[PDB]
């Protein structure tokens, strides 16, 4: 045998990625050798990208979605590295609220215990986040992200906390920071106000009840009737003690029936049908004449004004609307248009308070009752007036941490007003919903379907409640003067407080005294203080990053607004809005340039995974089974910007995908290791073959390049696989494999075949460092040659190079065109696959080929359809109208295995010599 006399064609680099031992080695390495702060160092930075890091909660270990979400900011963050910009990335933590003062509360009653001390609780939240920011920080790492992950920033480091407040500052000083009263979200669960983005829209059962209340002696002596009750359609019993008003739809005709039952008469039939009223009607009456008649409270006896209600509906219920001001917002605004009572005796944590017994509104029996736990009996209570009882679900609002549902109470709070004209940065007056929309027009959204979910929200968003009744945040830390009872907002009282907050952090604001936090030219006065002790929404901490991190540091960590931001879609909701608002109050324009989201991760049925429904698949679990670079391998080649399936399926397709590319990889660096590095420095001869692989290579570097931009990783990834699989395996490597193998290394054709490949691999080093780039330092480090070649001690040292300038390609050289030489290559295929089946011959070596078409090179012909021969021979195989197929008139060559030997057993003339070379 010849074997052992070909080209051995072998490299270190392994076939097995061998993931789970190896790139926690390399991870390692980039920590000790500090490669993030290298890759800012880098002399020859030109240009600047700044992308934001938003701020996870500092609790509990990464779910997936962190891990999406990390890999694809990687991918981004690497890509403007290696097209030669100075990179801005500093990770940060959201430390405060209720994502980590909840798990403190739940340990607290689970251990059976309390702590009410304000410095030692926040303490406990504080620690608590500490411990999470590292594990979660070192989980990050285990992905091969690189950012400043040794300097992330923390909300709850000193200097941001008096950053965030400094933020607060300015909204105040422009005018948009006010008190109202109003009912709003309240979660008795943690006895608190909340905003939108804590509220969790779900699926609840509730009664739904209809409900008489019968009009008073004298108002039916004013209808002229005899017998006249509103009825009013209600899911909460619970606020029927605080009923006020019913209110009616303006100049709309209400129908009386003949048992006395008045509705709106566009709701009458529905209302028959459901057996709510009867279906005789004997009068009918408009609205405008039923204003202040007056009704009884069937519950308590009260009276009920009859009013007219702004926006009414008739598509649902009666079309008389029971009126709770302490309990629904738009009720809240009747009551006040009417001058009527305000009732509202429900205490912090939904229960029923002594205002119910003081204003004779619900018997005493209820005192200390949870709302939601007195509506069975409430029903019960309302005897003949209930008309109707269904059970009904919708879709109903529910805390955010502690999951349970929320009330509605009028209560004062802090607000951030968003039709409220404020002036202007650059002098003129507009409201912050009209700069936010205007702000949004100016932001880039990928996908741009983004733009229009928030520009919904920011039409539709109601004023910003701020103040939170927790204790782990920033304080909205102002003094309210008693001789005023409005807030100081002079300068150097707010000046002051940040000061202090700077240097010692918020725990003063408990701590100290009020005249210890004041100016010392306000001492004297500080009989006349009180601190505001609610807290701000987290969602005013994280909204002030790019103030506290881009800002405050001057660019160092960044220039805002940033070039880019990356999260999940339900950021819309959360992180986009808050930040959009609060850089639309301090510079009139949004702190970010472009928007870029991506969305869930999801079980194999694409349900959202959860420890309630079993389906959870840990991050570790997935990392152990399939390595990091196959994770994110998966993330690329698939479409991030929607849910993202996990299963064993796709995650096996995409090992398929990376073995494919580790293979060629491995190929090409076997195929020039023997390369004489003396070839780099002189200019080779190409044949058309070879100029057709570089001009390809060209093309669709170009469509790579061209997706990757657009953050399309599938659709470049695709181009480089079938690259990968057409043209260079198939094509190409099959039609080289001779000459790698069994020509003499000194042969100049084998030598420029090497360039080539040392080419390609370079340009798969450079397009798939962003996303595999564990391996590609792995193939760095296995590969004198392409080290050498692209001037690159390791991956950090990547750059796209030039092919036409590193292989001294002339510059008018016209483009080789193979349409005519595939096309009979492809012919030539099919006509093999038939004989093979048949049995004719066992390969294309085995065949010659004498072609009709003589306006075609013959040594490409050979090449491209690997025959062993172009020409007429003896025994005829098939015949098309393009070619003409025979047995190769020849003996198998026992060492190339080409049938090109005169003599039976014996090497063909080119293996003699390379048999014989000294
Ligand atoms: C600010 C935002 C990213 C928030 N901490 C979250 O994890 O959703
Ligand atoms: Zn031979």
Redesign the pocket.
């Known amino acids: 045998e010849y074997k052992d006399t070909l080209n051995l064609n072998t490299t270190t680099f392994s076939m097995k990625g061998n993931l789970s031992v190896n790139e926690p080695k390399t991870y390692a390495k980039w920590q000790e050798q500090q490669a993030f702060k290298r890759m800012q160092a880098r002399k020859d930075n030109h240009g600047d990208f700044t992308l934001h890091d ?4 500092a609790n509990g270990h990464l779910h997936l979605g962190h891990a999406l979400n990390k890999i694809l900011k990687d991918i981004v963050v690497k890509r403007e590295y290696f097209k030669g910009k100075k990179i801005y990335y500093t990770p940060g933590w ?1 430390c405060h609220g209720l ?1 980590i003062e909840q798990q403190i509360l739940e340990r607290l009653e689970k251990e059976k215990t309390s702590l009410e001390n304000p410095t030692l609780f926040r303490e406990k939240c504080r620690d608590h986040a500490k411990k999470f920011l590292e594990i979660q920080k070192n989980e990050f790492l285990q992905l091969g992200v690189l950012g400043d992950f040794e300097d992330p920033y923390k909300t709850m480091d000193f200097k941001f906390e008096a950053s965030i407040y400094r933020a607060l500052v300015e909204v105040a000083k422009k005018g948009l920071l006010k008190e109202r009263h109003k009912p709003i979200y309240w979660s008795y669960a943690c006895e608190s106000a909340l905003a939108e983005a804590e509220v969790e829209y779900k699926m609840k059962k509730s009664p739904s009840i209809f409900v008489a209340f019968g009009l008073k002696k004298e108002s039916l002596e004013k209808l002229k009737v005899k017998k006249a009750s509103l009825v009013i359609w209600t899911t909460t019993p619970w606020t029927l003690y605080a009923n006020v008003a019913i209110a009616l739809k303006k100049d709309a005709v209400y129908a009386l029936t003949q048992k006395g039952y008045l509705v709106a008469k566009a709701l009458h039939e529905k209302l028959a049908a459901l057996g709510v009223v009867d279906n005789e009607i004997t009068h009918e009456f408009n609205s405008n004449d039923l204003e202040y008649l007056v009704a009884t409270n069937p519950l308590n006896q009260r009276d009920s004004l009859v009013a007219l209600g702004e926006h009414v509906g008739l598509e649902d219920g009666t079309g008389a609307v029971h009126t709770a001001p302490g309990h629904g917002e738009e009720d809240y605004y009747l009551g006040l248009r009417y001058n009527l009572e305000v009732l509202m005796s429900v205490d912090e944590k939904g229960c029923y308070d002594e205002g119910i017994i003081h204003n004779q509104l619900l018997d005493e029996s209820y005192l200390g009752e949870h709302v939601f736990k007195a509506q069975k009996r409430i029903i019960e209570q309302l005897g003949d007036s209930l008309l109707l009882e269904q059970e009904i679900e919708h879709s109903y609002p529910h805390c955010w941490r502690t999951h349970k549902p929320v009330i509605y109470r009028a209560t004062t709070q802090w607000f951030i007003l968003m039709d409220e004209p404020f002036i202007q940065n650059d002098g003129s007056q507009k409201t912050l919903r009209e700069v936010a929309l205007d702000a949004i027009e100016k932001v880039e959204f990928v996908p741009s379907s983004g733009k229009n979910r928030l520009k919904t929200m920011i039409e539709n968003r109601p004023d910003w409640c701020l103040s939170r009744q927790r204790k782990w945040g920033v304080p909205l830390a102002f003094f309210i003067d008693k001789r005023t009872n409005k807030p100081c907002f002079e300068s150097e009282v707010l000046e002051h407080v940040a000061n202090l907050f700077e240097k010692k952090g918020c725990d003063v604001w408990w701590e100290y005294s009020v005249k210890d936090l004041l100016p010392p030219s306000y001492q004297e006065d500080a009989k006349h203080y009180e601190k505001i002790m609610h807290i701000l929404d987290v ?1 005013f901490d ?1 909204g002030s990053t790019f103030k506290a991190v881009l800002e405050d540091y001057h660019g160092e960590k960044g220039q805002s607004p940033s070039d880019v931001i990356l ?1 999940g879609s339900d ?1 819309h909701r ?2 986009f809005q808050s930040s959009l608002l609060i850089g639309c109050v301090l510079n009139n324009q949004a702190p970010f340039k472009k928007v870029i989201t991506h969305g869930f991760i999801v079980d194999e049925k694409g349900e959202k995974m959860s420890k309630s429904k079993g389906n959870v698949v840990s991050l570790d679990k997935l990392l152990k089974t399939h390595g990091s670079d196959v994770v994110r391998l998966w993330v690329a080649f698939n479409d991030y910007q929607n849910d993202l399936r996990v299963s064993q399926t796709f995650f096996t397709q995409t090992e398929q995908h990376y073995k494919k590319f580790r293979n060629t990889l491995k190929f090409l660096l076997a195929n020039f290791s023997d390369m004489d590095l003396k070839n780099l420095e002189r200019p080779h001869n190409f044949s058309p073959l070879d100029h057709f692989m570089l001009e390809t290579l060209e093309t669709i570097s170009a469509g790579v390049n061209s997706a990757f931009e657009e953050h399309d990783f599938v659709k470049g990834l695709n181009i480089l696989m079938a690259f990968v699989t057409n043209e260079l395996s198939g094509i190409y490597l099959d039609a080289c494999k001779d000459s790698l193998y069994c020509d003499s290394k000194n042969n100049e054709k084998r030598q420029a075949i090497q360039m080539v490949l040392l080419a390609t691999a370079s340009k798969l080093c450079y397009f798939l460092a962003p996303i595999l780039t564990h391996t590609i330092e792995e193939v760095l480090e296995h590969s004198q040659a392409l080290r050498i070649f692209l001037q690159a001690k390791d991956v950090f040292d990547l750059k796209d190079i030039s092919v036409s300038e590193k292989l001294h390609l002339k510059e008018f050289k016209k483009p080789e065109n193979f349409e005519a030489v595939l096309a009979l290559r492809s012919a030539f295929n099919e006509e093999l696959d038939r004989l093979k089946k048949e049995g004719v011959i066992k390969n294309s070596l085995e065949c010659a080929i004498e072609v009709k078409e003589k306006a075609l090179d013959e040594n490409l012909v050979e090449e491209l359809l690997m025959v062993s021969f172009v020409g007429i021979a003896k025994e005829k195989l098939s015949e098309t109208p393009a070619f003409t197929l025979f047995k190769a008139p020849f003996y198998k060559c026992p060492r190339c295995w080409r049938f090109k030997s005169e003599l039976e057993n014996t090497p063909c003339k080119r293996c003699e010599q390379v048999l014989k070379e000294r």
């Open positions: 938003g701020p996870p909660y959201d994502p969602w994280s999260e950021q959360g992180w």
